[PDB]
Subunit: 186 residues, 3 copies
């Protein structure tokens, strides 16, 4: 007998209005508010809040202001994580990110989605699928990543890409939808 | 002899620097500031502000923080409206939204536009065209909707779409520009 | 023997963690915070802060709230500049903008980029290329402009465009990637 949270985490249909999920989201927005309200020189305070917010963080992290998260604990980040202005991590499911990954401004990672069927959707049933980004990845400004996507090691995503399909390692990919355009040496 | 506001509402050229429009916009930003500054647990306060801001609201509304509006009163929303993080409703003209509509994060609805002619444009003459979204519509993250668009009932718009043409009911549509890709049963 | 800042400005590889650049960025975020925290009626205060922030400003400027900048002094704006809600000017290099230019909401101008090579990139070496927008240009909502782009006089960019190539004057261009679709009379 799974709870709503357990359904959510394992990619099954769940109701986000579940009391425990509502509370977790509220806590997330508290840490997120504190992070976003720090003054420019409060570097160590922001790092602390990240370590209380994210599921896991490396030795070095550098995240620019306004972040948006839903849960926090589903975001797992490797060494030397960098995210620029105003990224959003809609982390209904795991958002797993490797080492030496860097997000330009306005990168959006969406793990949540809904039934295409209107009636099923209106009943409030909802889903997630995790996102996985490998090591040594650079994601350009305004990139949107959809649920269930994995991006391989050693990838560069061009600005404004909408990633609807998995991206194999050692490539440069751009576009809406995002397509590989070039291979890179390992 | 129409006022600037009357010209604006009916899709005619108008000057946004009109004194009355300037004041209405200022009031809008006041409510909008208050909404955006509420703490995470202030659910009822946010709902109240929405009811003071929007032209009309249903019994249930759920709008996530940072909203951007220009007027407020031009936004008319049906039952069970949901908008996620950081949507923007540039409501120079009517933005009419049906029942059971849900916006993912960063959905942008732009009703304002300008003359293509540089000289006419520089004179400050400006336009709007209303946007209409039907019942039971789900709009994905980072979608942009342009002026004068209507989206039919029972539609799903894919993440990152730029909607430049009307979308017929009972379809899934994605892309830049946004095209129907599949039909759905009613 | 160029400093890191000098390397940055002239389009050469540089380390953003240079002590002087870090401080300049912090100052920028201070002015930017003050700008973004003004109340709706504080028109003259916002204008003042812009004049302290931007490298140059014309007689008239009208910039809507939340701006994001990195340096400020690299942003050089002509007469009658208008930017709507939540634009971002990632001004690692010069962002030069002509007279009578108007940005819709969420216009993003990115001058910063990185090596495609993972090892070079991980060493922290980074680049910029300046962006130039001519006179009498109207840029639609959610447009992304990449580094080194120039946009000619008398251009209109459609909503949601990703500008990866230079745009010649007297044209309307839209799309991802952004392509000319029509010529305009001068």
């Amino acid at each position: 007998a799974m709870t709503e949270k357990e359904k959510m985490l394992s990619g099954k249909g769940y109701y986000a209005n579940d009391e425990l999920l509502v509370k977790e989201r509220e806590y997330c927005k508290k840490l997120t508010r504190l992070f976003n309200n720090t003054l420019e020189d409060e570097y160590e305070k922001r790092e602390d809040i990240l370590r209380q917010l994210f599921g896991s963080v490396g030795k070095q992290i550098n995240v620019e202001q306004n972040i948006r998260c839903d849960y926090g604990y589903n975001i797992h980040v490797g060494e030397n994580f960098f995210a620029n202005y105003d990224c959003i991590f809609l982390d209904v499911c795991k958002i797993e990110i490797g080492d030496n990954v860097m997000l330009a401004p306005n990168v959006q990672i969406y793990t949540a989605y809904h039934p295409i069927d209107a009636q099923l959707r209106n009943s409030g049933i909802e889903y997630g699928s995790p996102v996985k980004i490998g090591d040594n990845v650079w994601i350009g400004g305004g990139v949107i990543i959809t649920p269930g996507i994995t991006i391989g090691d050693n990838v560069v995503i061009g600005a404004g890409s909408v990633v609807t399909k998995d991206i194999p390692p050692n490539t440069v990919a751009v576009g809406n939808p995002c397509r590989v355009i070039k291979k890179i040496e390992e």
